[PDB]
Amino acid sequence: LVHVASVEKGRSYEDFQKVYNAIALKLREDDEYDNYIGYGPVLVRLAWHISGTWDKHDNTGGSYGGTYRFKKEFNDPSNAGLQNGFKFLEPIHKEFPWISSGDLFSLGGVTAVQEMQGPKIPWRCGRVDTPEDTTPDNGRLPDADKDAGYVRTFFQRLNMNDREVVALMGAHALGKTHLKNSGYEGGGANNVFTNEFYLNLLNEDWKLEKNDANNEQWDSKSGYMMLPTDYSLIQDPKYLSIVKEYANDQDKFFKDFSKAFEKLLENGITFPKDAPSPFIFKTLEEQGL
Ligand code: HEM
Numbered sequence: 001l002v003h004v005a006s007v008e009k010g011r012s013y014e015d016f017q018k019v020y021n022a023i024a025l026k027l028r029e030d031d032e033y034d035n036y037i038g039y040g041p042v043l044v045r046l047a048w049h050i051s052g053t054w055d056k057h058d059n060t061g062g063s064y065g066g067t068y069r070f071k072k073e074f075n076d077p078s079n080a081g082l083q084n085g086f087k088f089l090e091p092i093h094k095e096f097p098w099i100s101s102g103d104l105f106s107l108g109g110v111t112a113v114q115e116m117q118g119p120k121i122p123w124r125c126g127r128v129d130t131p132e133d134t135t136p137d138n139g140r141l142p143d144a145d146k147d148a149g150y151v152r153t154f155f156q157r158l159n160m161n162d163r164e165v166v167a168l169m170g171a172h173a174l175g176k177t178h179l180k181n182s183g184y185e186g187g188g189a190n191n192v193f194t195n196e197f198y199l200n201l202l203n204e205d206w207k208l209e210k211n212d213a214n215n216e217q218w219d220s221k222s223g224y225m226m227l228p229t230d231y232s233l234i235q236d237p238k239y240l241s242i243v244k245e246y247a248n249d250q251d252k253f254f255k256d257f258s259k260a261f262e263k264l265l266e267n268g269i270t271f272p273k274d275a276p277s278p279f280i281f282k283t284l285e286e287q288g289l
Helices: 013-029 040-051 083-095 101-115 148-156 162-173 196-203 228-235 237-247 250-266
Strands: 175-177 186-190 207-210 216-219
Touching: 013 040, 013 083, 013 101, 040 083, 040 101, 040 162, 040 175, 040 250, 083 101, 101 250, 148 162, 148 228, 162 186, 162 196, 162 228, 162 237, 162 250, 186 196, 196 228, 196 237, 216 228, 228 237, 237 250
Parallel strands: none
Antiparallel strands: 175 186, 207 216
16 A cells, blocks of 8 residues: 655645644643643654554555544544543644644644654654545554563564664653553653653662552652563563663664654655655744744
8 A cells, every 4th residue: 555645735844833833832831731741742642653553564554644533543442542632633733724634643743752852853744634444443552561572573563673662662751651541550740851761761669560450560669650561671681772772872862762753653654756855843942932
């Protein structure tokens, strides 16, 4: 299956920067969400989940078609809680009805990462909404209760290697788990993007406990937690090397996350040779807004 990026008619960097700005200004305004975490983390997770349905074998799923708008996908148990991100983005879509759904969802993740002081993430336009019958079935997103071998194999489907998987996982510095969404509870409640996932993995005293949903998770006294799949990055020697690297080099982590996240958001998309170059949006702060 081939999905060719098609630029929204007549649109250019300036149009997309205004969408970015509207998302960013709303992230600033709507501060109270999730006990003052704000919407940044959930938008990152949304961008990931709409992309992470991709299957490299047949080019089904992926961000291109915007299929999260359809009930089958919206209602995936793996997507529980992301409705909050969708409802955040609805007034943005109303204001900018010309942007495709996949472009909006992926741009929301870009904007969130950058506004939370993360790396710049180059972003390309041209995802085109596809029909309801193109929505992938539930079950393509990963389980949390599994080991390193499961994560490694899982991510081969999305054409990600060890370094890319460890880099992407660093997003688990953001936000928190919520028992009623996923059967996991806790976390740092952070809304600043840094390399502290890796630091926490290496430096905290972790205890394997059962939560109130009867699932195991790793907890520290400071209030941090790790899923079994997170903790697996220090139980596999290949992953552990990379965790140590990123714990010790903020800039390297930023650069590798940026590359991996862009790739995630673009898997499945064919960009014509004369497509615009990737856009790098200015933050509100950089614009003096
Ligand atoms: C093995 C892979 C992964 C698994 C099993 C996993 C699982 C989870 C679970 C169970 C939650 C909690 C959801 C809730 O209760 O609200 C969560 C949250 C989150 N995940 Fe992941 N995830 C994975 C990879 C990723 C990746 C690759 C990214 C993005 C680059 C991502 C970004 C996030 C973010 C930002 C949150 C916090 C959401 C919030 O605070 O509402 N995750 N993930």
